[PDB]
Structure formats: structure tokens, C-alpha cells
């Protein structure tokens, strides 16, 4: 019989089988349901698609055709929900968001 | 020949899906692979933890459903559960 990928069956790109293998050997529980790995793959594609799209905009308005991790930090710091999800993160080779203090501005 | 087994080509596929005309460095591959691994172990630990909370020996769509409602804040949760619901619905109908 012809074998089709479960990613192709679900219409996704992340491997459902690799996720299921990592869930079974990840010492979580000895039983894994059918919908859990495909649901896991779905939320992973959502997160990756959103962050890569934001990095694409950050590269596009910077006139760059290659995403640097500075684009990744400018994506991840410019949203309260992303910052709340990533409060305890340290991103390699990205720097810091450019902000200025109100008092440190000149008076005139 | 060490079989590192990263997710670089898969996130490359999805970025070429969503942004067809942009390249990307290997440093961002490292950032994204660390991101997927960190998020995955977080949500999987919460799913297993919730399954242990209800004396349940399995993880199904309901446990990971509640867990992604927990960890992802606000409207990220509702959009994620909508896309996950239609994904598991399409996989169910095959």
C-alpha cells in the first residue's frame, strides 16, 4: 500500500511522526493520543510562521534580504504577548531595542 | 556524520512558503531551533503535568488544548486553538 506522510495527511509541514516519537520517548506518559502530535505541529507552525513573518517585515523595512537575529529581537520585543511569552529569553547576536528616556532628552 | 537532527530545513520550508524571496542566516536557524525546542518542552511538560493532575495516563487533543489555552496569552491562544482545531479536523477526515 502507498504510504502518505501524516504531515501531508494533515496538510502541514512539520513532521507528525517525529513529534510523536519525541513525545513517546520524552518521559511524559506511556500513552499518547492521536490528536496531540498533529495539534502540537499546528501550534508550532503558527508560532514559526508568525515570528518569521514579523522578521520578514523587519528585514523588509530595513532593506535587507536576509534575516539577522536583530530582526528577530525587533519582532519579539514589539508585542506584549510575545514579550510575556518570552520574558526570560536571551537571544544570541541581537542587541537591544532602541529606546530613549524622556528626562534624558534635551530641554530645547 | 553525527546526526544532529535539527529543524532547519523545515523552518526553511515554511519561511519560503510565507516569504518566498528572502534568505536567512544560520544564526536565525539556531534561534528558531532553540525556540521550537524550548516552547515544545514547555508545553509538553505542562501537558504531561495536567495529565498527571487528572489521574490520566494519556495525552490527547484535550490536554494539549487546555495547555495551549494556558501558556499562550490572550488572543494568541484563541487563534492557535482555532488553527489547531481545523488542523486536527482535516487530519481526522484524512
Amino acid at each position, epitope marked *: 500500500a502507498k504510504a502518505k506522510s501524516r504531515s501531508s495527511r494533515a496538510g502541514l509541514q512539520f513532521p507528525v511522526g517525529r513529534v510523536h516519537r519525541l513525545l513517546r520517548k520524552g518521559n511524559y506518559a506511556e500513552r499518547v493520543g492521536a490528536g496531540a502530535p498533529v495539534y502540537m505541529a499546528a501550534v508550532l507552525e503558527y508560532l514559526t510562521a*508568525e515570528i518569521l*513573518e514579523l522578521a520578514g517585515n523587519a528585514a523588509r523595512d530595513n532593506k535587507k534580504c536576509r534575516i539577522i537575529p536583530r530582526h528577530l529581537q525587533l519582532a519579539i520585543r*514589539n*508585542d*506584549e*504577548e510575545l514579550n510575556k511569552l518570552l520574558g526570560k529569553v536571551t537571544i544570541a547576536q541581537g542587541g537591544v531595542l532602541p*529606546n530613549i528616556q524622556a528626562v534624558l532628552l534635551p530641554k530645547k | 556524520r553525527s546526526r544532529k537532527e535539527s529543524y532547519s530545513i523545515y523552518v526553511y520550508k515554511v519561511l519560503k512558503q*510565507v516569504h518566498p524571496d528572502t534568505g536567512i542566516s544560520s544564526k536565525a536557524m539556531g534561534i528558531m531551533n532553540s525556540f521550537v525546542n524550548d516552547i515544545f518542552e514547555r508545553i509538553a511538560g505542562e501537558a504531561s503535568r495536567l495529565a498527571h493532575y487528572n489521574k490520566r495516563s494519556t495525552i490527547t487533543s484535550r490536554e494539549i488544548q487546555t495547555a495551549v489555552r494556558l501558556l499562550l496569552p*490572550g*488572543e*494568541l491562544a484563541k*487563534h492557535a486553538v*482555532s488553527e489547531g482545531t*481545523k488542523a486536527v479536523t482535516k487530519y481526522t477526515s484524512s
Partner: single-chain antibody, 226 residues
Framework: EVQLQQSGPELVEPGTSVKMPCKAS????????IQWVKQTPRQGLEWIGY????????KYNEKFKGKATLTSDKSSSTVYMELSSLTSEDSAVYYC?????????????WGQGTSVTVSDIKMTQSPSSMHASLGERVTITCKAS??????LSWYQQKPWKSPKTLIY???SLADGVPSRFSGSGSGQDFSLTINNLESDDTATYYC?????????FGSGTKLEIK
């Protein structure tokens, strides 16, 4: 629960500085962007700009550059639009409405509308106006110029009322809308599907794209029931 408080209509002579608030409550005020849109009888709905209160990030339409000015107030949860040097062709209704930061998200809840009176992708609503009975079969076409990654959202506007969100991401039904409404299509061609018809369906319908930075509204389609 989500409420967008706005001021009333103003009778202003041209050339004067006008500022109006967009006070919001019932939700975390900083967590959502606030958009701005004006509607004229001759051009329809037309996007102006938006501000995101976390970093005060402002993006304006190119033809509204200089004319439009946004300020945000985190203390009173109010966002102000400033209009300077009022053109005579500025007598229109102004709407400010809530939108999340995601490109999958869209305009979910709308203000009542301030009728201020003064003393790029071309995307098009193909059907002009439909006449129907209580049980016919209707479909609205929203063909655009270039491609968008399903970033279409359908809106129903009653006359002298706020527009109502129907579909987000061109296929997914919004909260509170019944299952009678459904969107379809991806890329450039799109369709909106309504099976059952009632008397309240007599309104003007719009589709909105957000795949590019200048947001463009549709031509408008007036549905007529009996």
C-alpha cells in the same frame, strides 16, 4: 464587554485643529492596536492609520501623511486623532476600531462613529447591489489586484451604524456571528457565502484586505431583502 467610547459630531469651520478621543475599556488597553478609518459617501471606507501603545508605533497612509496625527494616553486609556488644516472635502464620519497585533487578526469591534463636519493594491467588490427574497442564493466576489495570503476580512455595515466583523482570515467565522455566514477563497479570488436570508440582512457589505501596509476597503455591496 469591549467598548469604544467616542465623541459626538462637530461643526468646525475649515483650517481648525480638531482632536477627538477613542476611549476604550473592558479589556487590556495596551494589548491591542487601535486603527482609524473614515468613510465618505463618494469614496467609501478609507484607512487612515494606527498606533500601538506599547512603543507608540505609528504608521500612516501615504496620502494622509502630515494631515493625520496620532497620540496615545496610557493613563486614561485614550487615543487621540488630530486633524490639522481642515480641507473642505473632509466632512465625513470617522471610526476608530480595535485590532490585535497579528496579521491573522483584524478589526473585531468598532466605535459608534464621529461625523466630523467641515464648514498600493486596488481590490474591488465585484457585485454592485443584490436584490433578493427571503430564501435566495447570494455570493459576493472580492477579487483583488495582487496576491494576499488569505488576509481578507468581511464586514457588514448597517446604515448610520458601526460596521460589524463577519469573517477573519477569509475563511474563519468571527465570534458571535451565526454559521449562516461563511467565507471562501484564497490568494486573489474570494467569495462570501450566505445561505439563509432575513430582514436584517438589508445592509451594505464590505471586504477588507490587510496583507500590505496601506489598507484598502472594497467598493461596497448593498444587499436588498424583499
Amino acid at each position: 464587554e469591549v467598548q469604544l467610547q467616542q465623541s459626538g459630531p462637530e461643526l468646525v469651520e475649515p483650517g481648525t485643529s480638531v482632536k477627538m478621543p477613542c476611549k476604550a475599556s473592558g479589556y487590556t488597553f495596551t494589548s491591542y492596536t487601535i486603527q482609524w478609518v473614515k468613510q465618505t459617501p463618494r469614496q467609501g471606507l478609507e484607512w487612515i492609520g494606527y498606533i500601538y501603545p506599547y512603543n507608540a508605533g505609528t504608521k500612516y497612509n501615504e496620502k494622509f501623511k502630515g494631515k493625520a496625527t496620532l497620540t496615545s494616553d496610557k493613563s486614561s486609556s485614550t487615543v487621540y486623532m488630530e486633524l490639522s488644516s481642515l480641507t473642505s472635502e473632509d466632512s465625513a464620519v470617522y471610526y476608530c476600531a480595535r485590532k490585535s497585533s497579528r496579521l491573522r487578526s483584524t478589526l473585531d469591534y468598532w466605535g459608534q462613529g464621529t461625523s466630523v463636519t467641515v464648514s498600493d493594491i486596488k481590490m474591488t467588490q465585484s457585485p454592485s447591489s443584490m436584490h433578493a427574497s427571503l430564501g435566495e442564493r447570494v455570493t459576493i466576489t472580492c477579487k483583488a489586484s495582487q496576491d494576499i495570503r488569505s488576509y481578507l476580512s468581511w464586514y457588514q455595515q448597517k446604515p448610520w451604524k458601526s460596521p460589524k466583523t463577519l469573517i477573519y482570515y477569509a475563511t474563519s467565522l468571527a465570534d458571535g456571528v451565526p454559521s449562516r455566514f461563511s467565507g471562501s477563497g484564497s490568494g486573489q479570488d474570494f467569495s462570501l457565502t450566505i445561505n439563509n436570508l432575513e430582514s436584517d440582512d438589508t445592509a451594505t457589505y464590505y471586504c477588507l484586505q490587510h496583507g500590505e501596509s496601506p489598507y484598502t476597503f472594497g467598493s461596497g455591496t448593498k444587499l436588498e431583502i424583499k
